[PDB]
A paper describes a structure:
In CoV, the virus envelope spike (S) glycoprotein is used for virus attachment to host cells and membrane fusion, and it is the main target of neutralizing Abs. The RBD in the open conformation engages the SARS-CoV-2 entry receptor on the host cell surface, angiotensin-converting enzyme 2 (ACE2), which triggers S protein rearrangements that lead to membrane fusion and virus penetration into the cell. We selected a panel of nine nanobodies (Nbs) from dromedary camels immunized with the receptor-binding domain (RBD) of the S, and engineered Nb fusions as humanized heavy chain Abs (hcAbs). Next, we used cryo-electron microscopy (cryo-EM) to determine the Nb binding mode to the RBD in a trimeric soluble S protein without the furin cleavage site and stabilized with a T4 phage trimerization domain, as well as with three proline residues in the S2 portion that enhanced protein expression and maintained its prefusion conformation.
The S-1.29 and S-2.15 reconstructions showed good densities for Nbs bound to the closed RBD and to one open RBD, but poor density to the second open RBD, so that, we only modeled two 1.29 and 2.15 Nbs bound to the S. The group B 1.29 Nb bound to the edge of the RBD core and to its inner face, in a region that overlaps with that described for class 4 human Abs. Nonetheless, differing from human Abs, the 1.29 Nb interacted through one side of its Ig domain (see below), which run perpendicular to the RBD edge, this binding mode and the small Nb size, allows the single Ig domain to accommodate between closed and open RBDs in the S. According to cross-competition experiments, the group B 1.29 Nb had a non-overlapping epitope with the group A Nbs, which was confirmed by the cryo-EM structures. This Nb engaged the RBD core, and its epitope was mostly outside the hACE2 biding region. In contrast to the other Nbs, the 1.29 CDR3 (FG-loop) and the GFC β-sheet of its Ig domain made an extended interaction with the edge of the RBD core and its inner face. The CDR1 and CDR2 of 1.29 were not at the RBD-Nb binding interface. The group B hcAb 1.29, which bound outside the RBM, was able to recognize all RBD variants except omicron. Contrary to other variants, omicron RBD core mutations S371L-S373P-S375F overlapped with the 1.29 epitope.
Author numbering:
A (entry chain C): 974 to 1146
B (entry chain A): 731 to 828, 855 to 1070
C (entry chain C): 293 to 518, 521 to 620, 641 to 674, 691 to 730
């Protein structure tokens, strides 16, 4: 029987200890299974918790460059919230939308010289050549302030002709 | 890893009613083992889905392959339909060589749709660079995209545009060198092989355990049913079932430990997609030796292969 | 009753979440059990003892030893030509299931009236003076009238039986002494006369003998066991293929389906084992045909439910089972029953496997990978966003 009281109350020492020994082998097996499984999980949960600590540390106390680490899109921030037995991060991210094409050119030929966006991209709506920034359409006249020259334009593959505004000369005039 | 399920009843008894009544009388260990076996499979399906299914739109490479000299016929889907796998991928797949209640379940994602995922990913990288990972894909001539990468690395665009042939020659040659190395040199997929080995060998054990006497008169429970009468029959059977139950439980635990290891490796692989492939990584040596430029994903029997471009001064 | 209930119990909850649950396992069972032992050839010479023309006297009972053969006692027992069948120690039947080291056949001839004394615990002239047997012997006594073979006109006096002797005879004792029996005046000293009588007398069988006095042939078969050499009889059965069958090939017992095999066994090889020493093929000894053994199908039942909440309609998936052996639709994961095949392609709802999924009537399709869109690539074209969106997601992570 599985009740060790009925085995104490039904049998005398020798076969009592026999049956009890069997129960104790079985129970000891079961405990030891349990404790091991609990272990394996505790290792899993410890891994998950140190991932969560990393997520605090980087997403919440700072802005993460790690793509999709702190949510889909370009991370902006995250807020932590408690849960019964874990944490919930609400992550703000910035997601571009409402696309629009543009013809591009790696550089611009002007005065026989190649110009290269200092930070941005050369784009044309249909006829006119603006230099924008990559993640938001904000076109803006091409200027020596916002382009940098590097050599002639016999070597760049795909360069395009255009005029690079020089924002002195009208100041001289 | 291989998704295995084990019928505890049959594997312990194997069509023996009296062994069955003994083991049900022994407790409910079969549930736990089964249901961990499940957990561990559905966790395998979840590694794959995570690592590969990052993009929800299947991008198609143009019919016209004008990428500024860069040649990616070797990684791009083969129209010849060798399962729609790139010649790298065929190479990787053919470089790895793959009854008692132990079955094998099939993976949810077939090799064909994994290859298709990698193809969408790789095409979205060639067309759009990293902006297919932040939202909607935006085209870019890929010469500019490589100028932007260079910019990121800490090189000016003129270095690329002046040098564009040389860089293209160079990246072709490196792809060809990967092609020979994976074609002739062996032991290149040692990790995936080791995983397959270590699983296959746990099974060959647990099977080979299934034929041990554990103190009984014999290891075939039929000869003990056919040679003995109930009382000592159940005795010997009880011993067999203690031994077999021990062996299963060992197995299932070891499989667990591994499944945790593989889950760690898979989430590392998902991070590597997410950052190296859908973007340019600042993390030094994370996406290869040198200044990361990009990475391309390729499928494998039971893992992923990242080909990472990096820029190395000289 | 039905799969949805079976699932309900498997989960111990009356409310089922939408998904697939693995409830039970379906097994095939053996039918038409078969046993096959080799083509037919080493039988014990019982006929050489029974049909034997010459038998010795009762006091000179002849003993023979039998070993290293196969004895078929069924023919002897079911003969109807013997009037004496007394097996002690073992049942007269079911003798084909017993194997012993040796068999001792003690044959002799007596008259019918004396057939009674041959049994344990009995006393009599023949038993005490001619042939005494052990009290606790394990064997069988056979005997039959032999009038036509032992009766001769004018008296067949070749048969002799001892009358007078002093002691008793001990078990398994053969005495041939012919010394004149002494009845007492002085020792005979090889001289007869008063109180000196010849120990043995002749039966003198005649054709007109009475039933009691008619001759009877008696043979006692004693089985000695202490490696057994003489075992039981090989009615093998017929071979059936392409069905789950419980088979026994020369002691090798198993369950499975036997099919024609292309494997070529060597002349001295009987059965072939696959890796892990599991039996894979067997050569049937009767005709030396090599047959591949395959475990007759079995595999898991998974139950696909859209949720009790939504509908009580269910689907079974028999896993890695060819369900010709059971809207049946075949997939690389097994077969699905109860779920209509469609060619469409949606997002995966309930994952079945091998690239098929189910969804709610319950429809089984081939999951779609997602909206397939080709990017309008051109070597001088870029796409730039003109708006943005502030997206807030939630990531939950267990800590403790
Ligand atoms: C997956 C599979 O084997 N499907 C089989 C098919 O090949 C075979 O022609 C038929 C005969 O039973 O049954 C079904
Ligand atoms: C770019 O593409 C057009 C057609 O798509 C092709 O004719 C042209 O030669 C290519 N050259 C450059 C510099 O983009
Ligand atoms: C299931 O049925 C209950 C019954 O009260 C209903 O109230 C609940 O909304 C349903 N749940 C789902 C998930 O549909
Ligand atoms: C799907 O349905 C039928 C067969 O069941 C087939 O005739 C039809 O053309 C298929 N539709 C496809 C492949 O789009």
């Amino acid at each position: 029987s599985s009740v060790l009281n009925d085995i104490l109350s039904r049998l005398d020492p020798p076969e009592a200890e026999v049956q009890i020994d069997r129960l104790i082998t079985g129970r000891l097996q079961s405990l030891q299974t349990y404790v091991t499984q609990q272990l394996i999980r505790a290792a899993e949960i410890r891994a998950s918790a140190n991932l969560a600590a990393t997520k605090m540390s980087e997403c919440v106390l700072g802005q993460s460059k790690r793509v999709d680490f702190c949510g889909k899109g370009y991370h902006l921030m995250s807020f932590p919230q408690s849960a019964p037995h874990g944490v919930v991060f609400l992550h703000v991210t910035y997601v571009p939308a409402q696309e629009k094409n543009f013809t591009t050119a790696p550089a611009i030929c002007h005065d026989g010289k190649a110009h290269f966006p200092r930070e941005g991209v050369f784009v044309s709506n249909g006829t006119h050549w603006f230099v924008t920034q990559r993640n938001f359409y904000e076109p803006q006249i091409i200027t020596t302030d916002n382009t940098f020259v590097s050599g002639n334009c016999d070597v760049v593959i795909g360069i395009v002709n255009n005029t690079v505004y020089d924002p002195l000369q009208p100041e001289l005039d | 890893m291989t998704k295995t399920s084990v019928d505890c009843t049959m594997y312990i008894c194997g069509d023996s009613t009296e062994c069955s009544n003994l083991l049900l009388q022994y407790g409910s260990f079969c549930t736990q083992l089964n249901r961990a076996l499940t957990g561990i499979a559905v966790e395998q399906d979840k590694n794959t889905q995570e690592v590969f299914a990052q993009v929800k739109q299947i991008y198609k490479t143009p019919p016209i392959k004008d990428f500024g000299g860069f040649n990616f016929s070797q990684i791009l889907p083969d129209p010849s339909k060798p399962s729609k796998r790139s010649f790298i991928e065929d190479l990787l797949f053919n470089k790895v060589t793959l009854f008692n209640g132990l079955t094998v379940l099939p993976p949810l994602l077939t090799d064909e749709m994994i290859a298709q995922y990698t193809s969408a990913l790789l095409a979205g990288t060639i067309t759009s660079g990293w902006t297919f990972g932040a939202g909607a894909a935006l085209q870019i001539p890929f010469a500019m995209q490589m100028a932007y990468r260079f910019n990121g690395i800490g090189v000016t665009q003129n270095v690329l545009y002046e040098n564009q042939k040389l860089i293209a020659n160079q990246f072709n040659s490196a792809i060809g060198k990967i092609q020979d190395s994976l074609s002739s040199t062996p032991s290149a997929l040692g990790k995936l092989q080791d995983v397959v080995n270590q699983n296959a060998q746990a099974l060959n054990t647990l099977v080979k355990q299934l034929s041990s006497n554990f103190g009984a008169i014999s290891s075939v429970l039929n000869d003990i049913l056919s040679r003995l009468d109930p009382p000592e029959a159940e005795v010997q059977i009880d011993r067999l079932i203690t031994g077999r139950l021990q062996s299963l439980q060992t197995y299932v635990t070891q499989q667990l430990i591994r499944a945790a290891e593989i889950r760690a490796s898979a989430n590392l692989a998902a991070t590597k997609m997410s950052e190296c492939v859908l973007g340019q990584s600042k993390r030094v040596d994370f996406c290869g030796k040198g200044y990361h430029l990009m990475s391309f994903p390729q499928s494998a029997p039971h893992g992923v292969v990242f080909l990472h471009v990096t820029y190395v001064p000289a | 009753l039905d799969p949805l209930s079976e699932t309900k119990c498997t989960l111990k909850s009356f409310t089922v979440e939408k998904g697939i649950y693995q409830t039970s396992n379906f097994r095939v069972q053996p039918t038409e059990s078969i046993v096959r032992f080799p083509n037919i050839t080493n039988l014990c010479p019982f006929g050489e003892v029974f049909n034997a023309t010459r038998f010795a006297s009762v006091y000179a009972w002849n003993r023979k030893r039998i070993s290293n053969c196969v004895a078929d006692y069924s023919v002897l027992y079911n003969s109807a030509s013997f009037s004496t069948f007394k097996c002690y120690g073992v049942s007269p039947t079911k003798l084909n299931d017993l194997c012993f080291t040796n068999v001792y056949a003690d044959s002799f001839v007596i008259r019918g009236d004396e057939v009674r004394q041959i049994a344990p615990g009995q006393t009599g002239k023949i038993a005490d003076y001619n042939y005494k047997l052990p009290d606790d012997f394990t064997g069988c006594v056979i005997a039959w009238n032999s009038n036509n073979l032992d009766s001769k006109v004018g008296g067949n006096y070749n048969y002799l039986y001892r009358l007078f002797r002093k002691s008793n005879l001990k078990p398994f004792e053969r005495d041939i002494s012919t010394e004149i029996y002494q009845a007492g005046s002085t020792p005979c000293n090889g001289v007869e006369g008063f109180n000196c009588y010849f120990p043995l007398q002749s039966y003198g069988f005649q054709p007109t003998n009475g039933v009691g006095y008619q001759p009877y042939r008696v043979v006692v078969l004693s089985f000695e066991l202490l490696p057994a050499t003489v075992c039981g009889p090989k009615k093998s059965t017929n071979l059936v293929k392409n069905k789950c069958v419980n088979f026994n090939f020369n002691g090798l017992t198993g369950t499975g389906v036997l099919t024609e095999s292309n494997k070529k066994f060597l002349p001295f090889q009987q059965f072939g084992r696959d890796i892990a020493d599991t039996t894979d093929a067997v050569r049937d000894p009767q005709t030396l045909e090599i047959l591949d053994i395959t475990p007759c199908s079995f595999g898991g039942v998974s139950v696909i439910t859209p949720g009790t909440n939504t509908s009580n309609q269910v689907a079974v998936l028999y896993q890695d089972v060819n369900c010709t052996e059971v809207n049946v639709f075949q997939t690389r994961a097994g077969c699905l029953i109860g779920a209509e095949h469609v060619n469409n392609s949606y997002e995966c709802d309930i994952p079945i496997g091998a690239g098929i999924c189910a969804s709610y009537s319950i429809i089984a399709y081939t999951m779609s990978l997602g909206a397939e869109n080709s990017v309008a690539y051109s070597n001088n074209s870029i796409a730039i966003p003109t708006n943005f969106t502030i997206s807030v997601t939630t990531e939950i992570l267990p800590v403790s």
